[PDB]
């Protein structure tokens, strides 16, 4: 049956490319199979692609957007101009390196990286690996990335032209459970925006709905708010989000079950790798990809906060009962 020529048994002769650039990827990309600021662009950098695409500008008579057809690498030269696609030259570059090298389609590429980087940091779930995006791709319309500065209402409408419910939005955002900020405030480069940014876990949820204690930096950056201790970064969709009616209930459900929340991540991102496109034409490659090391820790309000120092804003289902810890107040250390 399918034995690629390295020995690893695969499910098609497609997928035989993709552990050659597993090789690359790993050894050069992400320094040794690191989970540090590679993997976190390209979480940017996934979402970047594939949210330029949208139905309404389609129905109008305009060019929408291919989705994730990997725009943002063949066409950096006009997507990086973007506002939101700031702080990403090198890594696109890094990127359309080992996709010249490999023979591989840009789009596929992003989609690949993203699987391969999240099986870095702990915690993660396996990603669905497709292969067939064409190569070929029309830059993206410009904003169509929503921003920090902007409402929820905003967001919502957004998302939910590219095809997101807000439930979706929400779970789309634990990729925010390993992140940090370079451009929002210069000056706390590389604040991290939970306690854990190298875990992927539900300490993203639990700490956006703490009370806005700290303002971390100098002065205060674009769209930066209050947050819960010394080194931590809130930005302001985060904190809105969490907060909303709207999407304030799901958020809530996010914080006790890294289990679940992995699970709900999962098919958002499968979703999203698919936009422009239509999966029954694409070849599924997942077991190229592999696990990533468990997360044995369990949820938990940091330092010394209790239930009372959140702001629940679920009023039908009550805060879950989350362990505490016999703490200090944290100051993190910038994400590596
Ligand atoms: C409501 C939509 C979202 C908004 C407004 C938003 C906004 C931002 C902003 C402004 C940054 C900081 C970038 C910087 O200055 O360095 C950021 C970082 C990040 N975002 Fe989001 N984000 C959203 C959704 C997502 C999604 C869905 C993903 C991917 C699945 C994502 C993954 C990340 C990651 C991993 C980082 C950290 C980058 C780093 O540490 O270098 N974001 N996001
Ligand atoms: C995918 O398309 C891009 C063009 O949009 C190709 O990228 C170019 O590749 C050539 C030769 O391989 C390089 O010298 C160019 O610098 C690349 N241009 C850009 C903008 O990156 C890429 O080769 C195509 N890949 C496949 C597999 O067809
Ligand atoms: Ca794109
Ligand atoms: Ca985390």
Redesign the pocket.
């Known amino acids: 049956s399918v034995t690629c020529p390295g020995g690893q048994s695969t499910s098609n002769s497609q997928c035989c490319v993709w552990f050659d650039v597993l090789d690359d990827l790993q050894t050069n990309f992400y320094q040794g199979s690191k989970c540090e600021?590679p993997?976190?662009?390209?979480?940017?950098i996934?979402?970047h692609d594939a949210?330029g695409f949208s139905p309404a500008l389609t129905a109008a008579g305009q060019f929408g957007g291919g989705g994730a057809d990997g725009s943002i690498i063949a066409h950096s030269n006009i997507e990086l101009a973007f506002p939101?696609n700031?702080?990403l030259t090198d890594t696109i570059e890094a990127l359309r390196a080992v996709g010249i090298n490999h023979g591989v389609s840009f789009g596929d590429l992003i989609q690949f990286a993203?699987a391969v980087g999240m099986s870095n940091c702990p915690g993660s779930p396996r990603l669905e690996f497709l292969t067939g995006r064409s190569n070929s791709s029309q830059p993206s319309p410009p904003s169509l990335?929503?921003?920090?500065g902007?409402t929820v209402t905003a967001?919502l409408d957004r998302?939910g032209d590219a095809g997101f419910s807000p439930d979706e939005?929400v779970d789309?955002?634990?990729?925010?459970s390993?992140?940090?900020?370079?451009?929002?405030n210069s000056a706390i480069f590389?604040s991290?925006?939970d306690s854990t940014?190298q875990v992927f876990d539900t300490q993203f949820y639990i700490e956006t709905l703490l009370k806005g204690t700290t303002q971390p930096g100098p002065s205060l950056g674009?769209?930066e708010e209050l947050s819960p201790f010394p080194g931590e970064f809130r930005?302001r969709?985060?904190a809105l989000?969490a907060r909303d009616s709207r999407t304030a209930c799901r958020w809530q459900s996010m914080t006790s079950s890294n289990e679940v929340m992995g699970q709900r991540?999962r098919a958002?991102?499968a979703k999203?790798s698919v936009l422009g496109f239509d999966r029954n034409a694409l070849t599924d490659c997942s077991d190229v990809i592999p696990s990533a090391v468990s997360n044995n820790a369990a949820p938990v309000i940091p330092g010394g906060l209790t239930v009372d120092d959140i702001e629940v804003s679920c009023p039908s289902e009550p805060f879950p009962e989350i362990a505490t810890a016999s703490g200090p107040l944290p100051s993190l250390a910038p994400?590596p």
Request: net charge positive; aromatic share 6%.
């Open positions: 600021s993997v976190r662009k390209i979480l940017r996934v979402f949210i939101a700031g702080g993203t990335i929503p921003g920090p902007n967001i998302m939005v789309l955002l634990a990729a925010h390993l992140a940090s900020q370079e451009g929002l590389r991290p925006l940014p674009f769209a930005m969709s985060d989000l991540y958002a991102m999203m994400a």
